[PDB]
Curated annotation (Swiss-Prot), chains A, B:
Biotin carboxylation domain mapped to chain residues: 1-411
Enzyme kind, highest EC tier: ligase
Cofactor details (free text): Binds 2 magnesium or manganese ions per subunit.
Protein name: Biotin carboxylase
Organism: Haemophilus influenzae (strain ATCC 51907 / DSM 11121 / KW20 / Rd)
EC number from the UniProt entry: 6.3.4.14
Cofactor needs: Mg(2+); Mn(2+)
Pathway where it operates: Lipid metabolism; malonyl-CoA biosynthesis; malonyl-CoA from acetyl-CoA: step 1/1
């Protein structure tokens, strides 16, 4: 089975992956750019290989160099984390053709769900609810616009005298997404859902689980459709079905065929280790539990702590002169940052994920607020003040705010 | 109810208490010595009051100064943490006589269980199993020694020709202790048990929960005896019944009428917040759950990280130039220490409690091992190397090692 894994990523997720590997007794190979020699996980890894200069294009997206790292170290498998090459089918193809195990889905499946149109077709076939849509003549597309109902969106049109160069545009939906696992033994489970509606420019800021308002009955319906879809398309590994959720109905928008940034909130409420399940599934093992073993308990929240100006959102690279990370009951800290570490300019601005858990949503929120106040990151700016503004927002406290709320609120 | 609490303690437990207070919206008053002005919880507290110079005798054991802090701030209650004045009945008496709520048991009960002899009498009456014992004439005490069976121990005698100036001496018992809560509504629950057998000079080093080998059936018997004992003696608050456990039988040795250092392992396996329950019980509320709501899930471990030489055990006070604390799934960090903090000489050597949780004992242990390797405390010596030696000990990994094992092993 898996004895040595190349961690084809960086920052917090690479550390997350390294931790799962070490727990399972799996040797680690940290591939890194010249700028990431000081990454925590690189310093912790069993073997390190520099795969290029600082720019992503030349390092973490360098398909030949990463595969060569797998070859010279005699690794068995490659974990792509999220972002970078994790949903690149050519990379997954290349990895399997070179005789290594890609920790994720098969290339064919990545490519199927890598194209918005062919994804939606596969989902509709599978019985997963989709945005009503078109499924270049004037009267025709005026007819389909009319059937679907304005406003629509060519890929936003609000009237038919402006139909120009579809599917239903939902004005005020939430972002509710379903976590799944599928294995090579024909099993597929759903691990409740996450609400990630607090976004700026479609980039998530705060996530939570479960999603407020979602009953178990609704959870089992939309969840089982997602599990069956996994089986129909021959899915393998961890994945997320993302939906727009409005007036009680779900509408598919994307499957992330990979682990997601916000996976920890789901871990907290179900007791599942999603990265370990990834590794076990990749090695050929079945999912370590059955659907009936999964019971949502309590509530969890995640704040993405970024090195950026909290109003301006301009990155804030630099040396962290002092880090103090929070702790105590119900507080989890996923971060590669350490006192004296320099946050580089070349990649994303995420420096930590602060995750809280409580027996209720109210407790998870208060716990997040107290954890944030204890947190100190000196030397650079962070978005902690933004998190604090969100958490004390009366509408957020009520719950169920839609995907446009944050931008609206910041005005 | 409780609106303002004086935290009559320091270091990690004072921070633990402050966190629980803040979650409940309770104002905090940090009483501190002149040496503890820089304690994390002091820096976080709503109000601070210096109660004396560095020596404990003059500050944290200064009964009049602590009560005066409660008075001038208009506090409602005083939480004594563990150690210091937490099991001092005169202090509890004084606190209640001055009109403040003591967060713990009544004075009369503290004093009852504050005397080994009267404690054992109350336990025997209650139906809690005790060490067979005497319950100054020669032939008499030779007779009782004979009844009890050598070896015995005057408070160690192995033969009767050496009977000189009792109870059964257990050669190789484990330390297994039962967590309880009792409230002012007549309820008392038990929260499974902890094994704290890894000790040096009777000072605990590693704790775990549940205790290996203990069946649920055995748990319910010894647990329910402990709960009933609570009711019989009119117990209030959190408390622990400590037992020596050998060849399948429990023998009472002490009740700690207070919160315990190692409470977090129990929190991890039951989902209970023990410090919050303390505060709620003190305010007059019932325990927030029933016995039937408590189900042991998974396994947890705690390592007491001390500023001391790992072989020599001599304290190692000094400036922490760099702290890096571990995290990730199943890792909890309870500590007041921060980068740049100076560990003083005047108090205990504990600087952090590293707590791990997993679905099994094996996972909790591996998780602890990985967390310890990530942990960096530069500028002073710690006992981390000792923890690492314990965790990789084949006997510890099997589980069930007795209270003498650690000292034996270190030879």
């Amino acid at each position: 089975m898996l004895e040595k894994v190349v961690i084809a990523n960086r920052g917090e997720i690479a550390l997350r992956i390294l931790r799962a590997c070490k727990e399972l007794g799996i040797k680690t190979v940290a591939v890194h750019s010249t700028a990431d020699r000081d990454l925590k996980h690189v310093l912790l890894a069993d073997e390190t290989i520099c795969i290029g200069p600082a720019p992503s294009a030349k390092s973490y997206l360098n398909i030949p160099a990463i595969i060569a790292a797998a070859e010279v170290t005699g690794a068995d498998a490659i974990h792509p984390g999220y972002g970078f090459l994790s949903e690149n089918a050519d990379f997954a193809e290349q990895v399997e053709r070179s005789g290594f195990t890609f920790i994720g889905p098969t290339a064919d499946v990545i490519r199927l769900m890598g194209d918005k149109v062919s994804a939606i077709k596969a989902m509709k076939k599978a019985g997963v609810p989709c945005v009503p849509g078109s499924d270049n003549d004037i009267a025709k597309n005026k007819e389909i616009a009319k059937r679907i109902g304005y406003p629509i969106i060519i890929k936003v049109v609000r009237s038919e005298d402006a139909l120009e160069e579809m599917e239903k545009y939902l004005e005020n939906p939430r972002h509710v997404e379903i976590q799944v696992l599928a294995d090579t033994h024909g099993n597929a489970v759903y691990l409740a859902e996450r609400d990630c509606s607090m976004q700026r420019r479609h980039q998530k800021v705060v996530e939570e689980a479960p999603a407020p308002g979602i009953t178990e009955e609704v959870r089992r319906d939309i969840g089982s459709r997602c599990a069956n879809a996994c089986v129909e398309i021959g899915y393998r590994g961890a994945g997320t079905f993302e939906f727009l959720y409005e007036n009680g109905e779900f509408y598919f928008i994307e499957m992330n065929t990979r682990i997601q940034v916000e996976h920890p909130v789901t871990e907290m409420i179900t007791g599942v280790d999603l990265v370990k399940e990834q590794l076990r599934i990749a090695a050929g093992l079945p999912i370590s539990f059955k659907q009936e073993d999964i019971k949502v308990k309590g509530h969890a929240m995640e704040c993405r702590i970024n090195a950026e100006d909290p109003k301006t959102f301009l990155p804030s690279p630099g040396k962290v002169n002092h880090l103090h990370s929070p702790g105590g009951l119900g507080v989890r800290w996923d971060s590669h940052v350490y006192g004296g570490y320099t946050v580089p300019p070349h990649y994303d601005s995420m420096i930590a994920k602060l995750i809280t858990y409580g027996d209720t949503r109210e407790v998870a929120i208060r716990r997040m607020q107290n954890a944030l106040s204890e947190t100190i990151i000196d030397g650079i700016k962070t978005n902690i003040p933004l998190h604090e503004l969100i958490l004390e927002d009366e509408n957020f406290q009520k719950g169920g705010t839609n995907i446009h709320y944050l931008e609206k609120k910041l005005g």
